[PDB]
């Protein structure tokens, strides 16, 4: 939601990191993307892809995930 | 009970319990007459 505003400046985050082996330096080093917890920055381009498709809110992505779970079932 | 607790609740499960149980059951299955 904060990437669709300034996509050329915001780094897209893939998912959060929860590793009980990280030290405080590692947590601080990985806390980026404007979030407040260690994260991975996506390199798959799914952000750009979905933005182009027409996804704007997190609710759109959540609805898509629900539909794909239903389709897998 | 918020969603923020789910990573801490699950990662140990998926990473130590699920592998341990799967390994034990698979061991029992593969070594079984």
């Amino acid at each position: 939601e904060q990437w669709v505003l300034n996509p050329l400046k915001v780094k897209p985050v893939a998912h959060a990191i929860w590793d009980p082996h990280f030290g405080q330096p590692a947590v601080k080093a990985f806390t980026k993307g404007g979030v407040f917890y260690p994260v991975n920055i996506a390199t798959s381009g799914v952000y750009h892809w979905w933005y182009t498709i027409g996804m704007r809110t997190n609710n759109d992505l959540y609805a898509g995930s629900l539909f794909l779970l239903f389709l897998s079932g | 009970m918020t969603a923020a607790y789910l990573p801490s609740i699950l990662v140990p499960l998926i990473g130590l319990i699920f592998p341990g149980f799967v390994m034990g059951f698979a061991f029992i299955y593969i070594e079984q007459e």
Binding site: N58, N59, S65, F70, S72, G73 | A3
Partner: peptide
């Protein structure tokens, strides 16, 4: 922004898919 209720609905659908996956795995194993 994604609420705990939304995450719980997702988890329920995931559990349903897991049950169906176990059924398919059994049917294929036969």
């Amino acid at each position: 922004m994604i609420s705990d209720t939304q995450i719980f609905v997702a988890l329920i659908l995931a559990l349903v898919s897991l049950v169906l996956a176990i059924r398919l795995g059994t049917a294929l194993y036969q």
